[PDB]
Design an enzyme around this catalytic site. Structure first.
Site, short mmCIF file in Angstrom:
data_model
loop_
_atom_site.label_atom_id
_atom_site.label_comp_id
_atom_site.label_asym_id
_atom_site.label_seq_id
_atom_site.Cartn_x
_atom_site.Cartn_y
_atom_site.Cartn_z
N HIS A 170 0.82 -1.21 0.00
CA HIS A 170 0.00 0.00 0.00
C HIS A 170 0.86 1.26 0.00
N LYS A 212 3.53 30.08 3.27
CA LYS A 212 2.81 29.60 2.09
C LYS A 212 1.31 29.52 2.36
N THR A 271 6.50 27.10 6.02
CA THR A 271 5.24 26.51 5.59
C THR A 271 4.07 27.43 5.90
N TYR A 328 8.79 15.53 1.65
CA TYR A 328 8.75 16.87 1.09
C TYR A 328 8.84 16.84 -0.43
N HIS A 382 12.78 11.60 5.02
CA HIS A 382 12.06 12.86 5.19
C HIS A 382 12.12 13.73 3.93
N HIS A 410 13.87 12.60 13.65
CA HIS A 410 12.61 12.63 14.38
C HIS A 410 11.77 11.39 14.12
N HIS A 411 12.17 10.54 13.18
CA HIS A 411 11.58 9.22 12.99
C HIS A 411 12.22 8.17 13.89
N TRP A 445 7.13 -0.23 4.77
CA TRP A 445 7.81 0.44 3.67
C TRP A 445 9.16 0.97 4.09
N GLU A 474 11.94 12.71 1.15
CA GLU A 474 10.94 12.08 0.29
C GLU A 474 9.55 12.64 0.56
N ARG A 515 0.83 0.84 15.46
CA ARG A 515 0.82 0.71 14.01
C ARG A 515 1.05 -0.74 13.60
N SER A 524 15.00 5.89 -12.03
CA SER A 524 14.04 6.65 -12.82
C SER A 524 13.93 8.09 -12.34
N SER A 525 13.81 8.29 -11.03
CA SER A 525 13.63 9.63 -10.49
C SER A 525 14.93 10.43 -10.50
N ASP A 568 10.85 21.31 -25.49
CA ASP A 568 10.75 20.00 -24.85
C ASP A 568 11.68 19.96 -23.64
N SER A 599 -0.67 26.75 -5.61
CA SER A 599 -0.41 28.16 -5.91
C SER A 599 -1.05 28.57 -7.23
C1 HEA Z 1 0.42 8.86 -0.79
C2 HEA Z 1 0.41 7.91 0.13
C3 HEA Z 1 -0.78 7.24 0.71
C4 HEA Z 1 -2.12 7.25 0.35
C5 HEA Z 1 -2.77 7.97 -0.80
C6 HEA Z 1 -2.78 6.44 1.26
C7 HEA Z 1 -4.20 6.22 1.18
C8 HEA Z 1 -4.91 5.51 2.21
N1 HEA Z 1 -4.34 4.88 3.25
FE1 HEA Z 1 -2.38 4.71 3.71
N2 HEA Z 1 -0.42 4.67 4.23
C9 HEA Z 1 0.60 5.30 3.64
C10 HEA Z 1 0.52 6.17 2.50
C11 HEA Z 1 -0.73 6.42 1.83
N3 HEA Z 1 -1.93 5.94 2.17
C12 HEA Z 1 1.80 5.04 4.28
C13 HEA Z 1 3.16 5.57 3.90
C14 HEA Z 1 1.50 4.19 5.32
C15 HEA Z 1 2.47 3.59 6.32
C16 HEA Z 1 2.88 2.22 5.79
C17 HEA Z 1 3.65 1.41 6.80
O1 HEA Z 1 3.28 1.47 7.99
O2 HEA Z 1 4.63 0.73 6.41
C18 HEA Z 1 0.13 3.99 5.25
C19 HEA Z 1 -0.55 3.15 6.19
C20 HEA Z 1 -1.99 3.06 6.23
C21 HEA Z 1 -2.64 2.36 7.23
C22 HEA Z 1 -2.00 1.64 8.39
C23 HEA Z 1 -1.85 0.14 8.26
C24 HEA Z 1 -1.32 -0.31 9.60
O3 HEA Z 1 -0.52 0.43 10.21
O4 HEA Z 1 -1.72 -1.41 10.05
C25 HEA Z 1 -3.98 2.50 6.94
C26 HEA Z 1 -5.12 1.93 7.71
O5 HEA Z 1 -6.13 2.58 7.92
C27 HEA Z 1 -4.05 3.26 5.78
C28 HEA Z 1 -5.30 3.60 5.16
C29 HEA Z 1 -5.37 4.37 3.95
C30 HEA Z 1 -6.59 4.67 3.35
C31 HEA Z 1 -7.96 4.27 3.83
C32 HEA Z 1 -6.29 5.40 2.22
C33 HEA Z 1 -7.33 5.94 1.28
O6 HEA Z 1 -7.44 7.38 1.45
C34 HEA Z 1 -7.20 5.66 -0.22
C35 HEA Z 1 -8.18 6.59 -0.92
C36 HEA Z 1 -8.02 6.68 -2.42
C37 HEA Z 1 -7.25 7.61 -3.00
C38 HEA Z 1 -6.50 8.61 -2.17
C39 HEA Z 1 -7.13 7.66 -4.51
C40 HEA Z 1 -5.71 7.39 -5.00
C41 HEA Z 1 -5.32 8.36 -6.09
C42 HEA Z 1 -5.62 8.18 -7.39
C43 HEA Z 1 -6.37 6.97 -7.84
C44 HEA Z 1 -5.19 9.20 -8.43
C45 HEA Z 1 -6.08 9.11 -9.66
C46 HEA Z 1 -5.29 9.43 -10.91
C47 HEA Z 1 -5.46 10.59 -11.56
C48 HEA Z 1 -6.45 11.60 -11.05
C49 HEA Z 1 -4.67 10.87 -12.79
N4 HEA Z 1 -2.83 3.61 5.34
C1 HEA Z 2 3.36 14.77 2.47
C2 HEA Z 2 4.05 14.16 3.42
C3 HEA Z 2 4.39 14.71 4.76
C4 HEA Z 2 4.48 16.02 5.17
C5 HEA Z 2 4.26 17.29 4.39
C6 HEA Z 2 4.83 15.98 6.51
C7 HEA Z 2 5.01 17.19 7.27
C8 HEA Z 2 5.55 17.16 8.60
N1 HEA Z 2 5.78 16.05 9.33
FE1 HEA Z 2 5.47 14.13 8.81
N2 HEA Z 2 5.40 12.20 8.20
C9 HEA Z 2 5.08 11.73 6.99
C10 HEA Z 2 4.70 12.52 5.84
C11 HEA Z 2 4.69 13.96 5.88
N3 HEA Z 2 4.96 14.72 6.95
C12 HEA Z 2 5.15 10.35 6.92
C13 HEA Z 2 4.84 9.51 5.70
C14 HEA Z 2 5.54 9.95 8.18
C15 HEA Z 2 5.78 8.57 8.74
C16 HEA Z 2 6.64 7.62 7.92
C17 HEA Z 2 6.54 6.23 8.50
O1 HEA Z 2 6.94 6.03 9.66
O2 HEA Z 2 6.05 5.31 7.80
C18 HEA Z 2 5.69 11.11 8.92
C19 HEA Z 2 6.10 11.06 10.30
C20 HEA Z 2 6.42 12.27 11.01
C21 HEA Z 2 6.98 12.23 12.28
C22 HEA Z 2 7.34 11.00 13.07
C23 HEA Z 2 6.30 10.52 14.07
C24 HEA Z 2 6.74 9.13 14.51
O3 HEA Z 2 6.99 8.29 13.62
O4 HEA Z 2 6.84 8.87 15.72
C25 HEA Z 2 7.15 13.54 12.64
C26 HEA Z 2 7.72 14.03 13.92
O5 HEA Z 2 8.57 14.91 13.93
C27 HEA Z 2 6.69 14.30 11.58
C28 HEA Z 2 6.71 15.73 11.62
C29 HEA Z 2 6.29 16.52 10.48
C30 HEA Z 2 6.37 17.90 10.48
C31 HEA Z 2 6.87 18.79 11.58
C32 HEA Z 2 5.89 18.32 9.27
C33 HEA Z 2 5.80 19.75 8.81
O6 HEA Z 2 6.42 19.92 7.50
C34 HEA Z 2 4.40 20.35 8.71
C35 HEA Z 2 4.45 21.87 8.73
C36 HEA Z 2 3.08 22.46 8.47
C37 HEA Z 2 2.42 23.13 9.42
C38 HEA Z 2 3.05 23.30 10.77
C39 HEA Z 2 1.05 23.71 9.15
C40 HEA Z 2 1.12 25.03 8.39
C41 HEA Z 2 1.75 26.12 9.24
C42 HEA Z 2 1.04 27.12 9.77
C43 HEA Z 2 -0.44 27.22 9.55
C44 HEA Z 2 1.75 28.17 10.61
C45 HEA Z 2 1.30 28.08 12.06
C46 HEA Z 2 1.79 26.79 12.68
C47 HEA Z 2 2.49 26.78 13.82
C48 HEA Z 2 2.83 28.06 14.53
C49 HEA Z 2 2.95 25.47 14.39
N4 HEA Z 2 6.23 13.53 10.58
O1 LIG Z 3 8.46 12.73 7.47
O2 LIG Z 3 8.07 13.95 8.16
CU LIG Z 4 10.32 13.16 8.70
#
Ligand code: HEA
Ligand code: HEA
Ligand SMILES: [O-][O-]
Ligand SMILES: [Cu+2]
Ligand SMILES: CCCCC/C=C\C/C=C/C/C=C\C/C=C\CCCC(=O)O[C@H](COC(=O)CCCCCCCCCCCCCCCCC)COP(=O)(O)OCCN
Ligand SMILES: CCCCCC/C=C\CCCCCCCCCC(=O)O[C@H](COC(=O)CCCCCCCCCCCCCCC)COP(=O)(O)OC[C@@H](O)CO
Ligand SMILES: CCCCCCCCCCO[C@@H]1O[C@H](CO)[C@@H](O[C@H]2O[C@H](CO)[C@@H](O)[C@H](O)[C@H]2O)[C@H](O)[C@H]1O
Ligand code: CUA
Ligand SMILES: [Mg+2]
Ligand code: NA
Ligand SMILES: [Zn+2]
Lengths: 57, 93, 105, 72, 227, 51, 82, 259, 46, 144, 43, 79, 514
Positions: free
Chosen positions: M61, M319, M316, M244, M240, M290-291, M126, M242, M438, M156-157, M91, M255
């Site tokens: 997933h 923005k 952030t 971003y 991390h 922080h992970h 993952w 990734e 989890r 690829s990327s 292009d 935007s």
């Molecule tokens: C982009 C990343 C992404 C997305 C979209 C999702 C989508 C969803 N995820 Fe997932 N999820 C993860 C990234 C994502 N997840 C990650 C990283 C983990 C952690 C894995 C790990 O623990 O190892 C996780 C884990 C995770 C868990 C935890 C499993 C566990 O810990 O036991 C669960 C359970 O509720 C969950 C639920 C869902 C659900 C209900 C959706 C639903 O919202 C799905 C809904 C459908 C969509 C969002 C549509 C998809 C988009 C398209 C079809 C685009 C169409 C194409 C065009 C328009 C051109 N996710």
């Molecule tokens: C699109 C992907 C995405 C993005 C954008 C972010 C954004 C951020 N993430 Fe997240 N994060 C994940 C995807 C993402 N994360 C995933 C996939 C994991 C788990 C991976 C795994 O274990 O499988 C994860 C896990 C994760 C953890 C680990 C938790 C744990 O595993 O125990 C933490 C903790 O530091 C964290 C922090 C943050 C922070 C600080 C931001 C910040 O960038 C967010 C900043 C934005 C705001 C703060 C809101 C806008 C700001 C304002 C409105 C201004 C006012 C706000 C304040 C004054 C606070 N992230």
């Molecule tokens: O990954 O925040």
């Molecule tokens: Cu991180």
């Protein structure tokens, strides 16, 4: 050796509509078909190997 | 000793065209940014084209981040919709 | 920067240029409606008379429409502007959008 | 009867000014409410629980109820 | 343990967990405030016919957009780091207990005086006694003296695990070849539950942790009886 | 001229709301789904310990 | 450094460096490495558990010899070969 | 038709054959590691070298023979090569990270020391020092090759480029001998792991860079390069200097400080 | 040269909306179905 | 009137409240009477009739501000159709409960929960706020 | 944005067909697998 | 001698969450002291503090593995 | 002709179309995997099996959604389509290497599917932490096929990153500076630099896992002096950047969407938007640990990574508030694309704020490896990234295809999706705070209600996904051809018609310097 670049420039600027990977002549066609056959044949073989590896033995 | 060809001797195709045109101070393949005129109706910016239309990008003021894009057609000079500076297409070739 | 009076005098002068062409009329009105204001009646008056010199009745009605639109929910702005413009509207024979039925959806 | 000249400039900026201050007021109202209904509530609940808490008496009640592996 | 329909943290059993509850309340209010402010401002921008589409100067307003969040982050960091270091504070433990992670169970070692060690397996659902908790009970609980600073040492003998007890604010990864240390102090007697918190294979969900907190006298007699 | 929404808006809104509430109420209460609500104020505690 | 020849770095200067400094340095290192060549006495085999790791057999040979196995200096998990 | 200076490339099959070759090499490695067969792996390697040959052959056709490499196209290829080298630096950075992580914190299984108990490192003043002088000398000779080409000197360009290639081969033969003679293997714990994986990937890059230089050598023989236009040589020169600097870090970190 | 314009810059045909419906059904359906049949495949092994 | 695809590079007509005077007239080609109307427009507009004034407006513009800014009943279709598909989702959940889900564990039986509840109260689960704090240990009942 | 009228209009009945076929392509294969889950688990 | 041992006290040499080296050091210290006391005709009882600390801190499987390897001659540490 | 155009492509539009088709198909796979997850958790007990098959589904997933859906759609799809058009370029800089970047992905996807078919799958998460991913706890080809899948996606990327950076830097009009380029072009370049720097570190880490599994190295094996924590450092140094990489192209499209449908000619605070995206990218390289707050690191290191992580909220926030300032005073067009962008702003903010909660290492002790983290990243990914993808798709579909969507259907689609995602993931905050770990196939009885509601939400999202496929069919079925587009003067990508010709900007744009 002598500079034969002018002969290659004339050959590959010839107005014959051929793409660059085939403009060298018949040898390009042979090397292309060898490459593509191995790639496509190898890919089909890899799919067979997946099917075999997907079940216990 | 020698034995290494020069670009004058061996360059061909589009590279040679660019090299020979630059030696005449010409820019047929749009490598340089044109210098603007005053942009009035009497002194419009002259936009070369090989066709009867070309897209113009107008940076209305120095350091503007927004560029204004519009098709410039053959005929009477047209004005940028944001700042009004004049552009006139000059087809040839 | 510039006072409200200086801003209005700039736009009055802009639309009052005798040989203003159709492009400058459209450019003026399209730029003017981007500001956070409903244009003063003296500005609209100069713009309506520019439409007269350009033999463009339809743009004069459109200008009255955009005055009402720029007012948003403040219903009292447009009747006041029309009131102040009535001598110009009568002199130039400009019918309001309401008199033409163009306010009906 | 003529109509009076209404405010015609900066209506959008005035609407924003009014409601940003309004949002600030409501934010203070919520912060006070949250500190009283959540933060202080949690402070007093834990303070009231432990002020006269008797851990041995708590244990004896648990022991008599039969929950422990090590205390019958 | 967790109860049905629970919204927040389990009730604090340790002073450190009590500090985390108060820091979370402080932080959650800010999260609630900023998200509500953003949602409101969105509705504010979308509910007027008034327009202003010309170029907007940005420099002045971005001072507000920068200083205010910066101040807010500082009011979050200050209590956060204070709790972080008071967690790390030097304390004088009276007992050291080791736990080793396994697939799929925990083993515990009490080797301060005697060589006491045992395994701790989940009670299967079919063998639960009436009133016992599915997936949470163990055959051999971790008996510990209450109201005493305990040093827990966490490791593993195969894959990664994580030894967690939410009630006490505890979670320490179990890593083979590594001896991780945490401190444990329960203000109350009772039973406090946790679950393995690192994916570790087929029974990752079924190797829980159960602490039994009792007076020192009962812990001493229990330790002797388990030689 | 009246469009699709003028002709059918009222019916789509009313039928959609009625259908949605009815099938979710049925699903939530009539097929044995376990919601596991809080026992606070609803469950009478029963003796559990045995010899 | 010590050399001065600056003002114009060109083909002649860099050939000067190639034959005057670079290749002589290689000749000296070759010489030095040639006096220190010759086999050293292999040490006693101790079956240390952090060495000669075998968690999965190698995909070549008998699965127990490393890719560039040298019988003279590389012992197996059970010891040196003979 | 176009009045820009950029290159519209003919439709090409080599992207597809290259991607399929990666599938065959990766599935071949899985076939080799787990199912005791090298067949898929050999097909993937063969198609990979056929793809690379014909792909870069076409680039030479497009530039030397067709003239599509305007100054704007050359500048883009300059950015491409620099960015590619940067991504290669970060690849090796991970292995240096692994090395320093293990060596700065030797675990009890090693004896709590570095080098680990039972590990007898190579002498860094013998062949490792010789390899350092060899690659450093090749950096000097390849710079003489560059200036000879810019100044129009065909004979001395081929002279310096051959010397650079010989030194590159000299390094590869010395390293191959050092591998066979080493008393420690890749299976001798984290010392052997970091040593052979890091120096092995470097040795692979030395072979890649030597092949690149050999390509430039035969292209020079065929008068492909002008005194002003020769990015194939420049890219190979940048890549060779990258290979040299990586070794200097390997020598200091693993051979010297890690001994 | 290649065909240009709406419905011509895509690797699938939109000439017939019902043939297209079958192709989109097979295309998107096979992606959605694949994990379920992989789960079935793993359950049928042990 | 008729707008074509190849017209994309030419100035076009739009109806925008923030762009009241578009780049071109709504109607480009004039009939004999429409030509005469434009000539009459060069004279005093007081001599124009109401119908002629409306006709001049419709030649320059397509929709008026009132027409282009009008509200619609689209929200009824959107909200109503969204609830239908959300309602259809419940059908999938009903099918899943009936054909996919088996029995839930025996720990959810009413008697087990009652005994489990007491044991939780016996060990004082969450005694400060969460659970046991809502049980009256003196009166042996849930706090009112 | 402005656009031409549909060159091949899709009537409400045609949309009902496409909608039904689309949903069934998602639901039928997955439903079949989930319906036969118990057969897969114990065999 | 100055005994009343409950558990291993805080050690400023090892003040972090990772206590691997604390167990490893005291295991070395005991057996280095034990070897010194045994060789020159002393009493092992002077090594008792190291024995108490490492037994408190070290996992049983670590001590047992290290004990087997000292007897096998494959212990990598210096004793 | 067909094989030359679609298998031998050197055209940025066609290659972008291929990425979009690939990402759409992958989105189906990821959606099915997500429903299998929530079907297992929909009621207490076990539905599929033990944690092995469950976490194989969970692992796939994540991989499918991240590497095969979000990245190909945002970077390969919208990037290839829009970036050359937005700078007037004929292009990409390397149009033929661009084609291999795409065609590496179907084999990468094939390798992932192969790993779940052979043996018992890769049930590692993952993150693929050892020793669980090692050759002892995960013997067989599954994990190795997963590694090779990541290798092909990495290549690829990385090559795509080289292509985008070169194109954006070198192929602008000579008068156009970097500060005259659209924000989406900025977001793609910054994303490309993060890819260039982070993926090689990942490739090194997983190569060391490969050798540990097959060549008897011990990088991560304590028996040989290795450290499993070393892999975590190597993975998350990429990990991390990734996340971003996943959101930055979304930032760029938001935007453009907010600016367009506000009737504005430009976004508020252009240079502030550039500064924030570059600050976010830079800070994203120094916060990876922080992970790892629970792995046993020193307090001072935990104090730094707590602090450095929280800074990211400042750029952030700029923005978010600039997007609001772009709405301010606009002639708001309530298009479906605008609805997605408005949902993005609020829902991403919520997920961002919960990330700030997790940044506190003290509080993270109790929240790590719980569903509070799952609630965090699904708000920023499944609502943030996804809504930006959906908003961009419905906004630029008329440009790519030349046909218009049904706006009423698209608004219905948004309404269903909005309810589904929030019903799915908002209750997961409660599960996390209360202690649900989890990667569990089953949970204690107390967690039943919120798991039940969450799984019901996922079915609602499934209905939105199915409706989306129908809406795309209806557009191609009806063939409503685009006529005129508004605001072409500040949206260059629309100025060549819908769809633009195969070759665009054969004659480049005229921009003088004044
Ligand atoms: C982009 C990343 C992404 C997305 C979209 C999702 C989508 C969803 N995820 Fe997932 N999820 C993860 C990234 C994502 N997840 C990650 C990283 C983990 C952690 C894995 C790990 O623990 O190892 C996780 C884990 C995770 C868990 C935890 C499993 C566990 O810990 O036991 C669960 C359970 O509720 C969950 C639920 C869902 C659900 C209900 C959706 C639903 O919202 C799905 C809904 C459908 C969509 C969002 C549509 C998809 C988009 C398209 C079809 C685009 C169409 C194409 C065009 C328009 C051109 N996710
Ligand atoms: C699109 C992907 C995405 C993005 C954008 C972010 C954004 C951020 N993430 Fe997240 N994060 C994940 C995807 C993402 N994360 C995933 C996939 C994991 C788990 C991976 C795994 O274990 O499988 C994860 C896990 C994760 C953890 C680990 C938790 C744990 O595993 O125990 C933490 C903790 O530091 C964290 C922090 C943050 C922070 C600080 C931001 C910040 O960038 C967010 C900043 C934005 C705001 C703060 C809101 C806008 C700001 C304002 C409105 C201004 C006012 C706000 C304040 C004054 C606070 N992230
Ligand atoms: O990954 O925040
Ligand atoms: Cu991180
Ligand atoms: C100058 C000589 C260089 C060596 C040439 C030998 C083969 C070349 C292959 C190149 C592979 C490059 C990296 C390989 C990693 C480890 C190899 C280490 C280098 C080496 O070759 O060292 C030998 C390795 O042996 C062994 O099995 C080697 C087994 C080879 C298995 C191949 C595994 C390839 C894995 C590639 C993964 C992908 C790479 C990253 C791609 C990232 C894309 C983003 C050590 O031999 P020994 O028997 O222990 O004896 C030592 C004492 N006599
Ligand atoms: C040997 C056993 C196994 C080895 C595996 C791989 C094999 C080795 C490959 C070595 C590299 C060979 C590359 C040959 C390139 C020839 C094409 C070339 O050099 O093309 C040049 C352009 O540069 C360009 O594209 C330059 C682009 C080329 C970049 C290549 C850089 C190396 C990449 C190799 C892959 C690395 C893998 C990393 C491993 C982790 C042509 O431009 P000019 O010369 O200026 O113009 C011509 C003038 O005549 C005009 O007057
Ligand atoms: C999360 C993914 C989506 C899950 C939700 C699925 C929604 C409903 C899908 C229905 O799928 C069909 O269900 C039938 C039952 O209603 C099955 O017939 C089965 O049962 C019938 C009657 O019991 C028999 O006649 C058939 O032979 C037998 O296959 C049939 O196979 C299956 O395709
Ligand atoms: Cu042990 Cu999870
Ligand atoms: Mg963890
Ligand atoms: Na389950
Ligand atoms: Zn301008």
């Amino acid at each position: 050796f002598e500079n034969r670049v002018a002969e290659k420039q004339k050959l590959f600027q010839e107005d014959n509509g051929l793409p660059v990977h085939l403009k060298g002549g018949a040898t390009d066609n042979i090397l292309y078909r060898v490459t593509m056959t191995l790639c496509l044949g190898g890919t089909l073989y890899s799919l067979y190997c997946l099917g075999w590896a997907s079940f216990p033995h | 000793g020698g034995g290494v060809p020069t670009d004058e001797e061996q360059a061909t195709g589009l590279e040679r065209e660019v090299m020979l045109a630059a030696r005449k101070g010409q820019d047929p393949y749009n490598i340089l940014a044109p210098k603007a005129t005053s942009g009035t109706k009497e002194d419009p910016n002259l936009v070369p084209s090989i066709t009867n239309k070309r897209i113009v990008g107008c940076i209305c003021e120095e350091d503007n981040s927004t560029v204004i894009w519009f098709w410039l057609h053959k005929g009477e000079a047209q004005r940028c919709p944001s700042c009004g500076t004049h552009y006139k297409l000059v087809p040839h070739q | 920067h510039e006072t409200d009076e200086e801003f209005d005098a700039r736009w009055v002068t802009y639309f009052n240029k005798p040989d203003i062409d159709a492009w400058e009329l459209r450019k003026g009105m399209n730029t003017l409606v981007g500001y956070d204001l409903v244009p003063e009646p003296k500005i609209i008056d100069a713009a309506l008379r520019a439409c007269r010199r350009l033999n463009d009745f339809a743009s004069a009605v459109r200008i009255l429409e955009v005055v009402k639109d720029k007012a948003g929910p403040h219903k009292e702005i447009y009747p006041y502007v029309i009131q102040e413009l009535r001598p110009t509207l009568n002199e130039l024979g400009i019918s309001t959008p309401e008199e033409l039925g163009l306010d009906k959806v | 009867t003529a109509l009076a000249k209404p405010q015609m400039r900066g209506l959008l900026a005035r609407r924003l000014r009014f409601h940003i201050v309004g949002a600030f007021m409501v934010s203070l109202g919520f912060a006070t409410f949250y500190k009283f209904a959540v933060a202080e509530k949690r402070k007093k609940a834990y303070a009231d629980f432990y002020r006269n808490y008797d851990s041995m008496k708590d244990f004896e009640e648990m022991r008599k109820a039969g929950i422990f592996q090590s205390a019958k | 343990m967790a109860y049905p329909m629970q919204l927040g943290f389990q009730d604090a059993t340790s002073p450190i967990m009590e500090e985390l509850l108060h820091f979370h309340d402080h932080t959650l209010m800010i999260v609630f405030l900023i998200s509500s402010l953003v949602l409101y401002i969105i509705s504010l921008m979308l509910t007027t016919k008034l327009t202003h589409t010309s170029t907007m100067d940005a420099q002045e307003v971005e001072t507000i957009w920068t200083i205010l969040p910066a101040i807010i982050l500082i009011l979050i960091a200050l209590p956060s780091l204070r709790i972080l270091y008071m967690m790390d504070e030097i304390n004088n433990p009276s007992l050291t207990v080791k736990t080793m992670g396994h697939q799929w169970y925990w083993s515990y070692e009490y080797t301060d005086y005697e060589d006491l060690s045992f395994d701790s397996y989940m009670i299967p659902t079919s063998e639960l006694k009436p009133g016992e908790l599915r997936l949470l009970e163990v055959d051999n609980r971790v008996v510990l003296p209450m109201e005493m600073t305990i040093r827990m040492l966490v490791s593993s003998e195969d894959v990664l695990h994580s030894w967690a007890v939410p009630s006490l604010g505890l979670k320490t990864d179990a890593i083979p070849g590594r001896l991780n240390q945490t401190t444990l102090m329960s203000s109350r007697p009772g039973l406090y539950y946790g679950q393995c918190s690192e994916i570790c294979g087929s029974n990752h969900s079924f190797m829980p942790i159960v602490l039994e907190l009792v007076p020192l006298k009962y812990f001493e007699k229990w330790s002797a009886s388990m030689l | 001229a009246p469009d699709f929404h003028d002709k059918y808006g009222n019916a789509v809104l009313a039928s959609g709301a009625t259908f949605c509430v009815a099938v979710w109420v049925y699903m939530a209460t009539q097929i044995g789904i376990e919601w596991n609500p809080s026992p606070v104020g609803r469950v009478t505690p029963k003796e559990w310990r045995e010899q | 450094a010590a050399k001065g020849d600056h003002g114009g770095t060109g083909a002649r200067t860099w050939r000067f460096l190639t034959f005057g400094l670079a290749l002589p340095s290689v000749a000296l290192c070759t010489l030095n490495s040639w006096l220190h060549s010759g086999h050293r006495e292999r040490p006693a085999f101790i079956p240390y558990h952090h060495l000669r790791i075998r968690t999965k057999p190698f995909s070549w040979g008998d699965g127990n010899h490393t890719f560039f196995h040298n019988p003279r200096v590389n012992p197996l998990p059970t010891g040196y070969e003979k | 038709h176009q009045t820009h200076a950029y290159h519209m490339v003919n439709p090409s099959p080599w992207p597809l054959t290259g991607a399929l070759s990666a599938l065959l090499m990766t599935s071949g490695l899985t076939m080799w590691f787990h199912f005791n067969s090298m067949t898929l792996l050999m097909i993937g390697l063969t198609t990979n070298m056929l793809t690379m040959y014909q792909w870069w052959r076409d680039v030479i056709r497009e530039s030397t023979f067709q003239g599509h490499h305007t100054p704007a196209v050359q500048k883009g290829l300059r950015y491409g090569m620099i960015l590619f080298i940067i991504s290669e630096v970060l690849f090796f950075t991970g292995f240096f990270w692994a090395f320093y992580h293990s060596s700065l914190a030797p675990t009890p299984e090693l004896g709590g020391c570095w080098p680990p108990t039972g590990i007898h490192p190579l002498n860094p003043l013998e062949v490792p020092l010789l390899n350092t002088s060899v690659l450093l000398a090749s950096g000097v000779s390849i710079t003489w090759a560059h200036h000879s080409l810019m100044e129009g000197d065909r004979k001395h360009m081929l002279q310096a480029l051959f010397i650079t290639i010989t030194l590159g081969v000299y390094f590869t033969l010395l390293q191959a001998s050092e591998y066979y003679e080493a008393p420690f293997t890749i299976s001798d714990g984290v010392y052997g792991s970091t040593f052979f994986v890091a120096t092995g990937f470097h040795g692979l890059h030395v072979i890649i860079g030597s092949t690149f230089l050999i390509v430039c050598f035969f292209r020079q023989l065929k008068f492909h390069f002008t005194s002003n236009h020769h990015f194939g040589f420049e890219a190979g020169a940048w890549y060779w200097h990258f290979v040299d600097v990586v070794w200097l870090f390997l020598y200091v970190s693993i051979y010297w400080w890690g001994s | 040269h290649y065909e240009e314009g709406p419905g011509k810059n895509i690797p699938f045909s939109v000439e017939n909306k019902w043939r297209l419906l079958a192709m989109m059904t097979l295309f998107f359906g096979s992606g959605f179905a694949a994990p379920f049949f992989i789960v079935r495949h793993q359950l049928l092994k042990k | 009137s008729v707008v074509k695809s190849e017209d994309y590079a030419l100035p076009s007509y739009v109806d925008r409240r923030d762009y009241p005077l578009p780049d071109v007239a709504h109607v480009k080609n004039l009939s004999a009477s429409q030509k005469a109307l434009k000539e009459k427009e060069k004279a005093s507009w007081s001599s124009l009739s109401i119908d002629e004034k409306v006709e001049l407006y419709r030649l320059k513009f397509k929709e008026s501000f009132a027409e282009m800014n009008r509200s619609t009943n689209e929200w009824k279709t959107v909200v109503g159709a969204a609830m239908f598909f959300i309602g259809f989702t419940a059908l999938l959940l009903i099918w899943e409960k009936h054909y996919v889900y088996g029995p839930i564990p025996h720990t959810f039986e009413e008697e087990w929960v009652a005994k489990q509840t007491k044991r939780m109260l016996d060990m004082k689960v969450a005694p400060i706020q969460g659970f046991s704090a809502k049980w009256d240990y003196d009166k042996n009942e849930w706090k009112k | 944005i402005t656009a031409k009228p549909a060159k091949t209009p899709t009537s409400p009945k045609e949309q009902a067909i496409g909608l039904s076929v689309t949903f069934l392509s998602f639901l039928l294969p997955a439903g079949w697998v989930l319906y036969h889950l118990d057969n897969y688990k114990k065999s | 001698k100055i005994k009343n041992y409950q558990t291993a006290p805080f050690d400023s040499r090892f003040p972090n969450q990772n206590q691997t080296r604390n167990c490893w050091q005291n295991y070395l210290d005991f057996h280095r002291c034990e070897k010194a006391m045994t060789a020159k005709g002393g009493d092992v009882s002077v090594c008792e503090w190291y024995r108490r600390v490492y037994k408190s801190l070290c996992p049983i499987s670590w001590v047992s593995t290290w004990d087997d390897r000292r007897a096998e001659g494959t212990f990598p540490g210096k004793i």
